[PDB]
Design a protein around this nucleic acid. Structure first.
Ligand SMILES: [Cl-]
Length: 674
DNA sequence: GTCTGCATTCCTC
DNA sequence: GAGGAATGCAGAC
């Protein structure tokens, strides 16, 4: 037998990897259950012709935020040990268990939509940091999903990321020698007959290639050829994007192609200089000598990928003059500092506001230097210019020990790890005029790029410090997705809903609402929506919220869950398909009176609730059902108590009790009190 | 309070 | 109008 672990942010992310495997593997036997209270498993017997395989996948939901926060050891330490120095967490890590320890096979990130603008690089630190470890980094995204005006669920026009973002994965792969890729799955809203922006999309960009790659990695087989097919699709996405943008201020596909095939490097393109680097700065952001610094950059710079990306190049042939102008502007007279600035090499200049008016850091700026390092290499000389307001404590730490600031803040960690020179021309909150700093960070950057955490083997123990909201979620998901409907995968019975979308089925169609907001005017997005069709004359939609403790259930949460479903019913489903037949745009609106809507709050309670406490929770939340869960340690069991508010919820409880049976799931790990 | 994930409006060209 | 600049809310701690 072979055992693999799937460490995920939650049970849904873990199960997405299992669904990808089950899309290519058709198993002879499937068994589900728990290896511990927190860790569900799926066991499969399958064959490749005459060759049988027996695999078990043990799932670890909820990552640690430190070394012993939830789990006794942090699986993420395996990434820090290989050079992942940014505080970055993927969605899933898949490991192989051998000789009492875990070995990472890959890191996977799932994204619902191809993000655009600075949101495209906001989390680029993940791909950069995990990419430099040698462990494969797979970014999977749906192409396309429409952004909506939440007021009326009307679709906004499609926006695409700058072609340099998808390209960065390709360049990061080449620079490191590791497999870092962006893969695209056909979204339900990919409808090219209704949107002219998709006219030239090559449908061969859509990735069985991801399931093939995962299975070949699980089998310890050669994946070089599958990797090339995926890289080819990533490149064809850059082709689609660059051929749809204007060539005057952006790299053309033939320029990207000449970099990809190794003819030229991104800084030695023969056409470099046809557009300059022109950073756009809002007039309200200006202070000190920022405008004059931007003029000096635009006097010497050559564009890198796009004229208005927040970075560009100062070629070594112009570096002396650029440095003389900066030194004259900021009164830098120190002979030794000027020599450091005048090193005879190309200089990447990155310009970022960094901070909002109250000195709180810009999230998108965290990915700017990782994006530059993925495109140009981490050893490229980077001059980072910051002009946003700094709180007094931040400039104080810059003057005492910049690494102290980098240790506590992700933005400062990105700046300090990747910049050779950090220049600040910042307003200081509480003071009338800007502060100027010129930090020679070369030696510090070099030290960070060699740093790795303590080498040590990891075997995460399946018993966490304590049981909390991740465990409540795993239990709720297992009961309503596998035990009560009698399913073994995500592709089964009514799909229901979660944070990523809501599906409602009938006798002929599956209707789906995509792009669900966290809140509506009177509603809150449920953690899970369960559809039950064999209980009442009308179908039931059970909306559930999961919390660590009963007092974490907010006032009117039960009513808000129902009102969220009522909000969706006020609009045509995003997409629909015939359960017998392809996804199309939603055509017909659904009727709420055709459904019974109930709400439920789930939590962990160690028998600290009286009849009056339960009465108070019902009054506060308005939930139709409360699900009180508690673990028993000897023998390990989850004891479930279903508390109905009314007669309708009581019928649901009796239904759950009657159907708490399964040929696939080991229900023996549960005890339903009533 | 701070830090980070999430995602929408603002502003320059 | 395109698309990067800029911005804040929320949850978790
Ligand atoms: Cl093309």
């Amino acid at each position: 037998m072979n055992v693999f672990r799937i460490h995920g942010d939650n049970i849904i992310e873990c199960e997405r990897v299992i669904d990808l495997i089950l899309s290519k593997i058709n198993p002879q036997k499937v068994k589900r259950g728990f290896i511990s209270l927190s860790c569900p498993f799926i066991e499969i017997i399958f064959k490749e012709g005459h060759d049988y395989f027996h695999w078990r996948f043990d799932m670890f939901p909820g990552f640690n935020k430190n070394t012993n926060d939830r789990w006794n050891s942090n699986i993420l330490d395996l990434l820090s040990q290989k050079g992942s120095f940014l505080y970055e967490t993927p969605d899933v890590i898949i490991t192989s268990l051998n000789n009492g320890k875990e070995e990472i096979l890959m890191a996977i990130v799932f994204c619902s939509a191809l993000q655009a603008g600075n949101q495209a690089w906001q989390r680029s630190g993940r791909a950069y940091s995990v990419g430099r470890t040698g462990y494969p980094y797979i970014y999977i995204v749906d192409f396309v999903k429409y952004e909506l005006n939440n007021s009326d669920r009307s679709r906004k026009n499609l926006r695409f990321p700058n072609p340099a973002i998808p390209y960065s994965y390709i360049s990061h792969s080449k620079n490191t020698g590791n497999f870092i890729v962006q893969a695209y799955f056909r979204g339900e809203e990919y409808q090219p007959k209704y949107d002219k922006k998709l006219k030239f999309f090559d449908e061969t960009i859509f990735a069985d290639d991801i399931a093939d790659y995962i299975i070949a990695k699980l089998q310890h087989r050669d994946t070089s050829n599958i990797e090339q097919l995926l890289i080819n699709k990533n490149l064809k996405m850059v082709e689609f994007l660059s051929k749809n943008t204007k060539n005057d201020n952006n790299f053309t596909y033939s320029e990207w192609e000449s970099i990809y095939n190794g003819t030229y490097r991104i800084t030695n393109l023969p056409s470099l200089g046809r557009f300059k680097f022109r950073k756009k700065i809002a007039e309200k952001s200006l202070s000190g000598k920022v405008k004059e610094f931007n003029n000096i950059v635009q006097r010497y710079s050559v564009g890198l990928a796009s004229s208005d990306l927040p970075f560009g190049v100062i070629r070594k042939e112009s570096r002396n003059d650029f440095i003389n102008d900066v030194c004259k502007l900021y009164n830098i007279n120190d002979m030794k500092i000027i020599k450091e600035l005048k090193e005879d090499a190309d200089l990447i200049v990155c310009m970022l506001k960094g901070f909002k008016p109250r000195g709180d850091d810009n999230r998108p700026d965290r990915g700017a230097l990782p994006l530059v390092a993925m495109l140009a290499g981490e050893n490229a000389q980077i001059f980072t210019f910051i002009y946003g307001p700094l709180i007094k404590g931040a400039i104080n730490l810059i003057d005492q020990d910049i690494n102290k600031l980098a240790k506590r803040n992700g933005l400062w960690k990105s700046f300090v790890s990747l910049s050779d020179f950090i220049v600040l021309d910042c307003p200081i909150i509480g003071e009338s005029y800007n502060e100027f700093r010129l930090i020679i960070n070369k030696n510090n950057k070099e030290s960070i790029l060699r740093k790795t955490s303590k080498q040590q083997n990891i075997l995460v123990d399946p018993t966490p410090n304590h049981y909390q909201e991740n465990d409540v979620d795993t239990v709720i998901y297992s009961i309503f997705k596998y035990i009560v409907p009698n399913c073994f995968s995500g592709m089964c019975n009514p799909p229901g809903g979660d944070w990523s979308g809501l599906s409602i089925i009938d006798n002929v169609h599956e209707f789906r609402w995509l792009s669900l907001p966290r809140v509506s005017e009177n509603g809150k997005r449920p953690d899970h929506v369960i559809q039950i069709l064999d209980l009442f004359e009308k179908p039931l939609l059970l909306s559930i919220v999961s919390k660590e403790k009963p007092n974490d259930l907010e006032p009117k949460i039960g009513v808000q869950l129902i009102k969220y479903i009522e909000y969706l019913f006020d609009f045509t489903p995003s997409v629909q398909r015939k359960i017998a037949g392809n996804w199309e745009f939603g055509n017909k609106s659904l009727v709420p009176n055709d459904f019974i809507l109930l709400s439920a709050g789930a939590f962990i309670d160690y028998d600290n609730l009286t009849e009056n406490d339960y009465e108070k929770i019902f009054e506060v939340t308005g939930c139709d059902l409360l699900i009180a869960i508690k673990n028993q340690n000897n023998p390990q069991k989850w004891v479930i108590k279903f508390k109905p508010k009314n007669t309708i919820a009581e019928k649901l409880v009796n239904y759950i009790k009657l159907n708490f049976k399964s040929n696939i799931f080991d229900t023996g790990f549960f005890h339903i009190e009533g």
